[PDB]
TrEMBL record, chain B:
It comes from Yarrowia lipolytica (Candida lipolytica). This is NUCM protein. It comes from the Eukaryota. The lineage of its organism: Eukaryota, Fungi, Dikarya, Ascomycota, Saccharomycotina. Belongs to the complex I 49 kDa subunit family.
TrEMBL record, chain D:
The chain holds residues 575 to 655 of 655 of the full protein. Core subunit of the mitochondrial membrane respiratory chain NADH dehydrogenase (Complex I) which catalyzes electron transfer from NADH through the respiratory chain, using ubiquinone as an electron acceptor. Essential for the catalytic activity and assembly of complex I. It comes from the Eukaryota. The chain crosses the membrane at residues 40-73. Signal peptide: none annotated. This is NADH-ubiquinone oxidoreductase chain 5. It is found in: Membrane. Belongs to the complex I subunit 5 family.
Automatic annotation (TrEMBL), chain E:
Its EC number is 1.6.99.3. One of its GO terms (molecular function) is oxidoreductase activity. The keyword DNA damage does not apply. The keyword Transmembrane helix applies. This is NUVM protein. The gene is nuvm. Keywords: Membrane, Oxidoreductase, Transmembrane, Transmembrane helix. Residues 1-19 are annotated as: Disordered. The chain crosses the membrane at residues 53-70. It comes from the Eukaryota. Coiled coil: none annotated.
From TrEMBL, chain G:
This is Uncharacterized protein. The lineage of its organism: Eukaryota, Fungi, Dikarya, Ascomycota, Saccharomycotina. It comes from the Eukaryota. The chain holds residues 25 to 50 of 149 of the full protein.
Length: 469, 24, 64, 75, 90, 481, 26, 172
């Protein structure tokens, strides 16, 4: 469906005027919803963990990739709604959030790149999908060319992504030179015992992981996330993380790797410690993303990581979307718009939000306490599954470090709630304006999922036991 | 005050000047 | 019980609608037809999950 | 007791000492948008190669090096 | 050109309530003494006296009690002990 | 029922505008319901009785009768019933003690208070490690919000302490719970004494569990958060925290630790005795040089919890019974003292510095009588439950280790010192010049304090009245070959 | 100022008056 | 336990630390003959940390004839002493010593490894309930343990006796 959407959309966006952008985006939003609901029944193919190799052994289809695919569609639906609908109908918000003409096509193509990364069974397909996603994401960074910071960001991103892509291509070709093969499926226990592939496979893993910004190469990505338009940051900080991490989890090429162990430790420490002194909202959220990417990196050191990883990535996607949407909503109550790409920038600008919108702060509290991992919110069960996995496999020191990093990051998670439940002198008296029904309903759905997902935990594990065993 | 109680209103993290600000 | 699952999922839909009203700075019963709509939709999702889970249990039992 | 232990040492190994430590460490990790980042990526690649060479030699010898690296970055 | 919506009307946050007559006559000296004592941890420094109290109570006293408690574990049994019998088990 | 009751709640809210009458009524109904349960509770059996399961896969939204149990387990025995009765006794008084001094966002405040109470009450019903942990952490967001919004001047730091210290301990508790889950693949409390882990593994799990216990009880040397969180909490937060949340720790020892890690507990007991003797002596001494009323009352609780711990790890029936009775008596007395210092004096004068207060007997003789009674109860006068608890706990501790228990007998003296030093200045002397005359204690305040006083006196004159619920428990956990 | 324990506290005050204490009973 | 060659291992560590400090100095230069002038003493940081950690670790391991986390605790204490000497203040020196020693002691306790020892881990170990009369291994569980094992591990006294009381005090 995705290819058909891309083709049609190119035709229409060519033949439509600049005023039709939001209507087009609503059209695609509904189309993706329709695909998600009508084609969901293809799950049935994956009963008993049945795996399918497709396209001449280039693509691999199993329950895991089907789930990642559905999750990516859900994320795309939510993200496209933010562009397809106005928060408010005033002039200010027409200036604040207007979709570019080609933005939707870039979004769909980057989604296609991500899905091809997930399904990749062969290194040529992996490299082509990586380059497709990398190019589309460069352009998404750069499409808002009136922003000085966005253009500077796109250029830095181009160069860092190019270097990491060259590292990846080098790793692929060294694997070819040693094994005369482009598939990991050719690998076996005998082959891993016989030959020392550790260097090559770790170089490939590192080349992929530095593209989502794990320490000690974080800062360039945090700067890019800071300097992009806020509705762009909601996307570019999420989809590449999902695709790359899912590919690495599915491939399992760094089991018990000492280098990945040390880098995951370092990423946890830097993500937790470095986010403490932050005063800008989006830099705080980017360091949050770094710490959570560390939590997921830990899962690359062990076999049978499917359940913990899927649960964690789903709850993280929901929490991330929700926190960005809350920051977006809280824009209507700020008294100073900093600029047209990033209306709110400093955490202190939320001060006293509870007096303007009590339930917005309720939602904020719920999402923050999910991030900290307070039961019975989803975040707690995500961390619980991760701890179960790593302790089952004897990563004791890493478990201690994970404890410590969650503690430390709770400080700058609660910074947001702290300033949000403080008091502001000028308190909204009244307003005729209504927030858009659709986005408020979506934000509410995310909040209710985070709050009451745990009631379905046992049902989920029962389903999982029949589709992934 | 910040998340550590430190004073809050150069490194990019604490830099306040805004090249995208409408007045610049 | 299927009826209990439908009641629960509808309760989730009602919660979503109520939270949506409050987030819009609106009264709890601002648009009462939205409660019915959201309850029906979330009950549909709950029903789908229930059918999938029952089928999964059936498959697990049939391999015995 | 009440001052020197309770509001002294126990707060050192508590909210106040941790606050100071985190302030310093965070300041150091935040303390030419391109050239610098490129130098970073080379330094990471070469440092990783040399560190793994050392690890192959003897893992005990690399622990002080990692400690020193973290001391550079955070302190 | 970027300004919040004119549609918003903001008034004061008043907390309401009945202003009671002020039944305490605050003493500035007492308040400063109280503030100094309350936030003593912000100004604590390690000196010879402070370090001495730290090393006594956090180190020497726990060590003494630990030696006592691990040396005397299971040593005594008193229930109904009679004349000539040893109240010690080892 | 639930639909109709929700309708009733909505209508009452729309018409009256303040939920607090509805919450008071509700909590009273809950108390009556628990009493009905006690009526129908069989005491000649060591088995959990009112069992039910939630979030089972066959019935996610209802109760499960399935042959596979993958949800969360709930049920009660005598030990849980005692603390549940304490909880349902305390909750309505917690609502009532702030009946007039909250004049803003009052509905939210009462909602947070009642939610915290219900969370603790449900926590006592939990029958497996995961649900216990879930409800054990669920309070921290509510406490954080409550303290931050409705607290005194230094409430921001208080809220951050109460969240961070408890999370810090709870995550090591989570490590231990994860190890148990993956090693046993079971989590329940019903049959967890049947699994005999290797001694080394027991020794390792015990560490995480006991770190959680150190932060939550608290014990020396990680007790420094409690005096803050108490002093800047509003009255309901302080009463709940002192009267229930600390007893959650003692219940945690008895339920989670002793049945599973018996041999490791035997190995580690002298370390526990070191830590408890430390907390008693050192916190009791540190109480002498405090200048805040609520801080002093907070420091008292830590020492009493130290005596409770010394009782509960004594490996004797008398020690365990003493720990339970002391927990209950402390849950009666400490909320009363917190009521005094943070609801009567603080609501009349809005200050907590000790220097301002003096000679309150002249204008407020009734308040002075209440202070005298509550203070002699807190320091352990016989015919009060506190004395029975401290005496039995000290007996168990002296049996377990004669030297350590004998030294711990100094707690009687130390408690008398700090408490009577406070009440001496508060009650007598010439009426203070800094403050003016205000009303004496009112009917509501007197009602709450009378409830607490009669409860502690009743269990102090005849502590046996609790035995029918606890005679199984006093044998269920001692490890003698 | 006079007693050893008061002297011990002199580094721990910043911008608080170093008072010479006199027993109020005397 | 057969000894570490303290002298040799410490010499190799000196070499590694010197090289690492050189690399850090070159980087530091590039990011800011002046490289060592404006080094900040990082070469000394690396060299001293290396020598201190390795020398103290081997020394302690040889003296105690054991290999466990305590050796890492001592070595971390020495490393922290070196790193905290740079502050030139006694409280900071003591703090670095004790806290680095504690952190490294924790590290050595968990296995002195950042990745896992796969063969010893639970996933690769015999688990579950044991069979008929087999010896208990670390991850295994039973329904009853042998009383002699209790008496030997826990020790006699405090209610631990070779024979149940009622049996021993039975009359005939
Ligand atoms: C152990 C052996 C330590 C021996 C040294 C004692 C020590 C460490 C105590 C740490 C305790 C650790 C406990 C932690 C847990 C342990 C498991 C405390 O020495 C303290 O002694 C007190 C009492 O004498 C002083 O208090 C008050 O002092 C008077 C003011 O009027 C009153 O006379 C007294 O009445 C007050 O009370 C303190 O000022 C003094 O620091 C440090 O003392 C010495 O070390 C040096 C180098 O760092 C310190 O810096 C030096 O001076 C600086 C300018 O000054 C410059 O930088 C520089 O010139 C130099 O570097 C000084 O501090 C120095 O003095
Ligand atoms: C709440 C505070 C948390 C802090 C404490 C956590 C630290 C855990 C330490 C305990 C523990 C993991 C236990 C994990 C349990 C759950 C984890 C708990 C949560 C994780 C956060 C790590 O044990 C480590 O101890 C270190 C010394 O301190 C050693 O350091 C190194 O020493 C040198 C190398 O030889 C080097 O010189 C250097 O590399 C280091 O110096 C390590 O080699 C060693 O693995 C023990 O695990 C292991 O124990 C052994 C025998 O016990 C088990 O095998 C047994 O074999 C027979 C006898 O062997 C028995 O007859 C048999 O019955 C049993 O089969 C194993 O199966 C395995 O299980
Ligand atoms: C765009 C840029 C383009 C530039 C291109 C030019 C660069 C080309 C090469 C660089 C490529 C990229 C470099 C990446 C970083 C290299 C680091 C790296 O791979 O991890 C190491 C390499 O382990 C070597 O044994 C390898 C040792 C390293 C080789 C020796 C060092 C030689 C230097 C001599 C001076 C992988 O071990 P690992 O983690 O699995 O470690 C362990 C361990 O090896 C096994 O024993 C265990 O069984 C296993 O479970 C595992 O846990
Ligand atoms: C398992 C997890 C998977 C999925 C779970 C997520 C969601 C649940 C599933 C389906 C959700 C479908 C819900 C459809 C029913 C929801 C519903 O009442 O209509 C809308 C929102 O409608 C969506 O915005 C529909 C947008 C759908 C996107 C939701 C996805 C999140 C809310 O009513 P509303 O009273 O505010 O709408 C009124 C009224 O319609 C207008 O006439 C008024 O003029 C206007 O003022 C407005 O307020
Ligand atoms: C009418 C069609 C509408 C279906 C549209 C689905 C859209 C997905 C969008 C976002 C993902 C959001 C949550 C996914 C739920 C997992 C389903 C599943 O059970 O996960 C399992 C695998 O468990 C796992 O690994 C762990 C999953 C981690 C979930 C973390 C959140 C838990 C709390 C969510 C509670 C659910 C809300 C219900 C409220 C009444 C895959 O199940 P499956 O591959 O057999 O497909 C299901 C059959 N299906 C296609 C017809 C729907
Ligand atoms: C003719 C056109 C005009 C009339 C439309 C005709 C349509 C017919 C059907 C209308 C809807 C009835 C079915 C759904 C019930 C929703 C009723 C409602 O309006 O909200 C219920 C309640 C607020 O009710 P209300 O008393 O009006 O309060 C308003 C301000 N206090 O809000 C709540 O109680 C929220 C509770 C949600 C969570 C409950 C979870 C437990 C399950
Ligand atoms: C947010 C924190 C995390 C949340 C995790 C858990 C949330 C749970 C939500 C609360 C729901 C639990 C209370 C209702 C469940 C019990 C209903 C019931 O029917 O009891 C079952 C039990 C057996 O009944 P049955 O087998 O049907 O036989 C009847 C014979 N005539 O019959 C009985 O024996 C009676 C049992 C009495 C139970 C007393 C419960 C005390 C408190 C009740 C309300 C608590 C609500 C908590 C709200 C805050 C969230 C914790
Ligand atoms: C952070 C905040 C976290 C919040 C956590 C709270 C989670 C709340 C989940 C509620 C599920 C638990 C309900 C307890 C069960 C009590 C009960 O039995 O309710 C009756 C009915 C099912 O009853 P039944 O299965 O027939 O058993 C009775 C037989 N005598 O039960 C039903 O029909 C379902 C009605 C409940 C619907 C709840 C929907 C969500 C609330 C909005
Ligand atoms: C030769 C023969 C033997 C060699 C042995 C191995 C070589 C090790 C190389 C040592 C690298 C030391 C790091 C370094 O170069 O740091 C310099 C630089 C800091 O520069 P600057 O920006 O001034 O930072 C000051 C803060 N205000 O920092 C940087 O440039 C950034 C750091 C990049 C280095 C990557 C290290 C890999 C990850 C290590 C894990 C850390 C601990 C985790 C456990
Ligand atoms: C709220 C926040 C709460 C935080 C709680 C504290 C967290 C940790 C703080 C830092 C503690 C650092 C511990 C370092 C201990 C040093 C060490 O090397 O431990 C190893 C020691 C022996 O281990 P092993 O090799 O197996 O020898 C067996 C001989 N019977 O293993 C041991 O015997 C244990 C030695 C330490 C005992 C516990 C210390 C306090 C915990
Ligand atoms: C292995 C060890 C695991 C535990 C120790 C390391 C965990 C780090 C906790 C972070 C922290 O210290 O958070 C700081 C908190 C309180 O926050 P605050 O200092 O008042 O400032 C932040 C709040 N403001 C900005 C609003 C004022 O204090 C603690 O709870 C310390 C508990 C350590 C136990 C000894």
């Amino acid at each position: 469906m995705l290819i058909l959407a891309i083709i049609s959309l190119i035709t229409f966006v060519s033949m439509s005027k600049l005023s039709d952008n939001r209507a087009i985006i609503r059209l695609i939003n509904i189309y993706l919803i329709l695909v998600l609901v009508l084609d969901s029944f293809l799950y049935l193919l994956f009963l008993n963990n049945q795996t399918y190799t497709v396209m001449g052994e280039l693509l691999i289809f199993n329950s895991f990739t089907f789930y990642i695919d559905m999750l990516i569609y859900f994320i795309m639906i939510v993200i496209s709604s933010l562009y397809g609908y106005n928060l408010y109908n005033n002039n200010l918000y027409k200036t604040l959030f207007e979709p570019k003409k080609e933005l939707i096509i870039l979004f769909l193509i980057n989604i296609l790149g991500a899905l091809l990364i997930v399904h990749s069974n062969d290194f040529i397909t992996l490299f082509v999908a990586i380059e497709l996603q990398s190019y589309s994401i460069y352009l998404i960074t750069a499409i808002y060319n009136s922003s000085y910071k966005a253009s500077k960001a796109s250029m830095l991103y181009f160069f860092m992504g190019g270097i990491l892509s060259i590292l990846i291509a080098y790793s692929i070709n060294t694997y070819y030179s040693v094994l005369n093969s482009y598939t990991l499926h050719s690998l076996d226990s005998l082959i891993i015992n016989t030959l020392d592939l550790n260097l090559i496979l770790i170089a490939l893993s590192l080349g992929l992981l530095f593209k989502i910004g794990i320490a000690p190469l974080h800062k360039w990505l945090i700067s890019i996330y800071e300097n992009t338009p806020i509705l762009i940051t909601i996307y570019i900080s999420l989809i590449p993380k999902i695709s790359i991490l899912s590919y690495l989890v599915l491939s399992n090429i760094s089991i018990n790797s000492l280098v990945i162990s040390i880098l995951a430790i370092l990423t946890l420490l830097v993500g937790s410690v470095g986010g403490l002194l932050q005063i800008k909202i989006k830099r705080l959220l980017a360091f949050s993303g770094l710490t959570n990417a560390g939590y997921m990196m830990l899962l690359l050191l062990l076999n049978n990581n499917e359940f913990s990883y899927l649960y964690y990535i789903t709850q993280y996607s929901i929490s991330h979307l929700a926190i960005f949407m809350i920051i977006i909503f809280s824009i209507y109550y700020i008294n100073y718009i900093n600029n047209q790409y990033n209306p709110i920038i400093y955490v202190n600008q939320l001060k006293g939000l509870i007096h303007d919108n009590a339930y917005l702060v309720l939602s904020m509290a719920i999402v923050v306490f999910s991030f900290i991992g307070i039961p019975p919110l989803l975040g707690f069960f995500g961390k619980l599954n991760i701890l179960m996995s790593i302790l089952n496999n004897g990563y004791y020191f890493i478990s201690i470090v994970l404890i410590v990093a969650s503690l430390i990051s709770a400080l700058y998670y609660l910074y947001l709630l702290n300033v949000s439940i403080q008091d502001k002198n000028n308190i909204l008296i009244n307003s005729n304006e209504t927030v858009s029904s659709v986005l408020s309903y979506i934000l509410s759905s995310l909040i209710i999922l985070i709050t009451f997902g745990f009631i379905y935990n046992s049902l989920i594990i029962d389903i999982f036991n029949v589709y992934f065993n | 005050s910040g998340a550590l109680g430190q004073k809050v209103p150069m490194v990019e993290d604490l830099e306040t000047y805004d090249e995208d600000s409408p007045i610049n | 019980a299927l009826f209990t699952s439908l009641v629960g999922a509808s309760g989730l839909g009602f919660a979503t609608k109520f939270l949506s009203n409050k987030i819009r700075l609106k009264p709890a019963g601002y648009y009462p037809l939205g409660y019915v709509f959201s309850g029906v939709a979330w009950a549909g999702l709950g029903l789908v999950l229930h059918n999938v889970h029952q089928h999964s249990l059936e498959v697990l039992e049939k391999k015995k | 007791i009440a001052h020197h232990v309770d509001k002294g040492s126990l707060y050192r190994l508590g909210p106040v000492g941790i606050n100071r430590l985190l302030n310093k460490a965070s300041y150091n990790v935040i303390n030419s948008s391109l050239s610098m980042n490129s130098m970073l990526i080379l330094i990471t690649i070469v440092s990783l190669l040399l560190l793994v060479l050392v690890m192959n030699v003897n893992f005990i010898i690399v622990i002080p090096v990692l400690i020193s690296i973290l001391y550079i970055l955070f302190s | 050109e970027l300004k919040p919506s004119s549609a918003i009307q903001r008034g004061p946050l008043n907390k309401g309530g009945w202003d009671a007559p002020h039944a305490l006559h605050n003493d500035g000296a007492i308040d400063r003494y109280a503030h100094w004592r309350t936030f003593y941890q912000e100004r604590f420094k390690y000196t010879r006296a402070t370090g001495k109290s730290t090393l006594i109570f956090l180190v020497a006293f726990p060590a003494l009690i630990g030696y006592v408690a691990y040396q005397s574990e299971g040593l005594f049994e008193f229930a109904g002990k009679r004349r000539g019998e040893s109240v010690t088990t080892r | 029922i639930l639909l109709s009751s929700l309708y009733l709640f909505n209508r009452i809210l729309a018409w009256q505008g303040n939920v607090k009458h509805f919450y008071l009524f509700a909590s009273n109904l809950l108390l009556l319901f628990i009493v009905v349960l006690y009526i129908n509770f069989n005491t000649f059996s060591n088995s959990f009785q009112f069992n039910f399961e939630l979030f089972n896969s066959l019935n996610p939204f209802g109760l499960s009768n399935s042959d596979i149990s993958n949800g969360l387990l709930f049920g009660i025995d005598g030990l849980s019933l005692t603390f549940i009765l304490l909880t349902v006794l305390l909750i309505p008084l917690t609502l009532l003690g702030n009946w007039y001094n909250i004049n803003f966002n009052s509905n939210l405040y009462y909602t947070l208070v009642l939610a915290i109470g219900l969370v603790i009450l449900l926590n006592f019903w939990a029958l497996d490690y995961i649900s216990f942990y879930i409800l054990f952490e669920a309070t921290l967001p509510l406490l954080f919000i409550l303290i931050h919004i409705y607290g005194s001047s230094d409430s921001e730091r208080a809220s951050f302490y109460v969240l961070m210290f408890t999370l810090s301990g709870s995550l090591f508790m989570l490590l231990s719970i994860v190890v148990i889950s993956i090693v046993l693949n079971t989590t329940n409390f019903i049959n967890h004494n049947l699994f005999v882990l290797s001694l080394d593994l027991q020794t390792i799990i015990w560490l995480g569990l006991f770190i959680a216990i150190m932060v939550k009880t608290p014990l020396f040397p990680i007790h420094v958060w409690l005096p803050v969180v108490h002093s800047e909490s509003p009255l309901a937060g302080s009463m709940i925290l002192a009267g229930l949340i600390l007893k959650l720790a003692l219940y945690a020892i008895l339920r989670l630790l002793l049945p599973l890690l018996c041999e490791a507990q035997i190995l580690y007991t002298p370390m526990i005795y070191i830590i408890s003797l430390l907390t008693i002596i050192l916190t009791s001494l540190a109480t002498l040089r405090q200048i805040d009323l609520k801080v002093i009352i907070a420091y008292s609780s830590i020492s009493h919890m130290g005596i409770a711990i010394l009782g509960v790890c004594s490996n004797t029936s008398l020690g365990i019974y003493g720990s339970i009775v002391l927990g209950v008596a402390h849950g009666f007395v400490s909320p009363a003292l917190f009521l005094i210092v943070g609801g009567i004096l603080y609501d009349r004068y809005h200050i907590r510095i000790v220097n301002y207060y003096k000679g309150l007997t002249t204008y407020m003789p009734q308040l002075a009588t209440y202070i005298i009674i509550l203070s002699f109860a807190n320091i352990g006068t016989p015919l009060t439950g506190n004395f029975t608890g401290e005496f039995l706990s000290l007996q168990g501790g002296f049996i377990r280790n004669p030297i350590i228990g004998g030294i711990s007998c100094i707690s009687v003296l130390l408690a008398a010192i700090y408490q009577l030093k406070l009440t001496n200045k508060l009650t007598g002397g010439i009426s203070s010049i800094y403050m003016h005359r205000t009303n004496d204690v009112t009917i509501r305040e007197k009602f709450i304090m009378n409830i607490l006083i009669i409860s502690t006196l009743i269990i102090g004159i005849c502590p046996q009245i609790m035995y029918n619920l606890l005679y199984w428990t006093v044998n269920n956990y001692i490890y003698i070959i | 100022i006079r007693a050893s324990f008061d002297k011990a506290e002199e580094p721990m005050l910043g911008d608080y008056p170093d008072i010479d204490p006199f027993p109020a009973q005397l | 336990f057969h000894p570490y060659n303290t002298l040799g291992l410490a010499t190799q560590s000196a070499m590694v630390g010197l090289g690492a400090g050189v690399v850090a100095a070159a980087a530091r230069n590039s990011l800011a003959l002046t490289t060592f002038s404006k080094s900040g003493g990082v070469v000394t940081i690396f060299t001293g940390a290396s020598i201190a950690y390795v020398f103290t670790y081997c020394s302690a391991a040889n003296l105690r004839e054991r290999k466990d986390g305590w050796n890492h605790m001592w070595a971390g204490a020495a490393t922290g002493a070196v790193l905290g000497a740079r502050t030139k203040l006694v409280p900071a020196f003591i703090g670095w010593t004790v806290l680095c020693g504690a952190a490294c002691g924790l590290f050595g306790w968990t296995g002195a490894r950042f990745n896992a020892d796969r063969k010893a881990s639970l996933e690769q170990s015999p688990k579950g309930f044991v069979q008929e009369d087999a010896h208990q291994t670390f991850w295994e569980v039973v329904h009853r343990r042998p009383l002699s094992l209790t008496v030997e591990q826990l020790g006699e006294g405090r209610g631990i006796n070779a024979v149940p009381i009622a049996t021993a005090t039975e009359a005939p």
